[PDB]
């Protein structure tokens, strides 16, 4: 590892969790500013908001899973910073 990598992993872990959880919030409230981030198609306007709401759930889960990877990076880095 080395302490350089562990320190980078701490900074990345903090930043990743902060941004991805905040995105999780905006996706769960169906915020309009996030529309460009949602990976929909021209057919997803059919009937009403049902498809875009399902995609809002998927991108919320994407960010939640990615935040989980940053939590794992964090727990690793908080050990390695003491071990190197």
């Amino acid at each position: 590892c080395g302490p350089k990598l562990a320190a980078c992993g701490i900074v990345l872990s903090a930043w990743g969790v902060i941004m991805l959880i905040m995105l999780g919030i905006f996706f769960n409230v169906h915020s309009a500013v996030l529309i460009e981030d949602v990976p929909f198609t021209e057919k997803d306007f059919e009937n009403g908001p049902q498809n875009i709401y399902n995609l809002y759930e998927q991108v919320s889960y994407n960010c939640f899973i990615a935040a989980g990877l940053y939590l794992l990076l964090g727990g690793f880095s908080f050990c390695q910073v003491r071990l190197n």
């Binding site: 169906h30 309009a32 529309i35 306007f45 009403g48 908001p49 875009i52």
Partner: protein, 77 residues
């Protein structure tokens, strides 16, 4: 409700920081620094916020939105 209530709240909040703050500072070598920091913080915050909130009054033209966002404004809210 009226915009005057926010204006009086913000003016009171920063006015106390910029007046009552200084009036509670102790005697000591740092006194002039502490007073200057309180006053300058209140003046800059007040002026900067006041300009931004005043500029949002009576918009001369609204936002213009992409086609897809206009379609989503039918249902998301």
């Amino acid at each position: 409700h009226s915009f005057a209530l926010p204006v009086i709240i913000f003016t009171t909040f920063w006015g106390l920081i910029g007046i009552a703050g200084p009036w509670f500072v102790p005697k000591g070598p740092n006194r002039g620094v502490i007073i200057t920091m309180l006053v300058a913080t209140a003046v800059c915050c007040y002026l900067f916020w006041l300009i931004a909130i005043l500029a949002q009054l009576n918009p001369l033209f609204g936002p213009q939105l992409k086609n897809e966002t206009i379609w989503y404004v039918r249902f998301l809210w």
